[PDB]
């Protein structure tokens, strides 16, 4: 009707990528506290009914690999899909431990023409990272 | 026929071009808010409502505090991008 059908054996898979330590080359510091979030996110999404698995300090290749494999899994009995990214980031890109990779490439795998089992089902991405360097001063 | 780009939703911790504030002690602001709003209404509010509350919660309650006068008292607002075509509820 007007809402997504949530009538499935499973709610969906929730992938949580938690990058805390980065390669010396990347020049990015350690994201302390990122574990405090991951645990909180893990508990939260588990409570909603997600079958959540967490991946730590992943190389760009790794992250690409995971999201690709997952898009190739069979989501026929899943109500939806959810992915969470906790890392360093910049405009349009996210950091792996070895470098950066385009967010659009990580999410493209789930396009309808590339992941039928999730066709017409919500695909959720939560990203906690930077998107630039500008700051917000506030007002009044 | 369905748009291959449809039914996607992105919940960014910050707007394009800005910084996301994480508290090495309590964790990032977006996640703190997202978790609290979830572990309290996740089962009874549509996805957009939840995210709006996270936006408000983040927009208000938080305000950075660092030495660098240029990184002192800064604010942050999350960004939600939606291609959903139905309402989303995590129940029933």
């Amino acid at each position: 009707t007007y809402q997504y059908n949530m009538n499935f054996e499973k709610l969906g898979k929730c992938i949580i990528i938690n990058n805390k330590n980065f390669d010396k080359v990347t020049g990015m510091g350690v994201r302390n506290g990122t574990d405090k979030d991951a645990e909180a996110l893990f508990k939260c999404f588990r409570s909603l009914g997600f079958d959540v698995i967490v991946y730590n300090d992943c190389s760009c290749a790794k992250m690409q690999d995971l999201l690709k494999k997952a898009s190739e899994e069979d989501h026929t009995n899943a109500a939806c899909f959810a992915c969470i990214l906790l890392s360093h980031g910049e405009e349009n890109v996210i950091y792996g431990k070895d470098g950066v990779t385009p967010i659009k490439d990580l999410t493209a795998h789930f396009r309808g023409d590339r992941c039928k089992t999730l066709l017409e089902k919500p695909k959720l991405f939560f990203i906690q990272a930077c998107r630039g360097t500008e700051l917000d001063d506030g007002i009044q | 026929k369905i748009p291959v780009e449809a039914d996607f939703l992105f919940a960014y911790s910050t707007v394009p071009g800005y910084y996301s504030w994480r508290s090495p002690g309590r964790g990032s602001w977006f996640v703190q808010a997202l978790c609290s709003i979830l572990e309290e209404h996740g089962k009874d509010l549509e996805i957009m409502q939840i995210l709006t509350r996270v936006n408000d919660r983040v927009a208000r309650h938080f305000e950075s505090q660092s030495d660098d006068p240029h990184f002192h008292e800064k604010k942050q607002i999350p960004c939600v991008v939606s291609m959903l075509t139905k309402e989303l509820y995590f129940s029933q």
Binding site: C130 | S13, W21, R22, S28, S66
Partner: peptide, 4 residues
């Protein structure tokens, strides 16, 4: 308070 740090930035990501």
């Amino acid at each position: 308070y740090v930035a990501d």
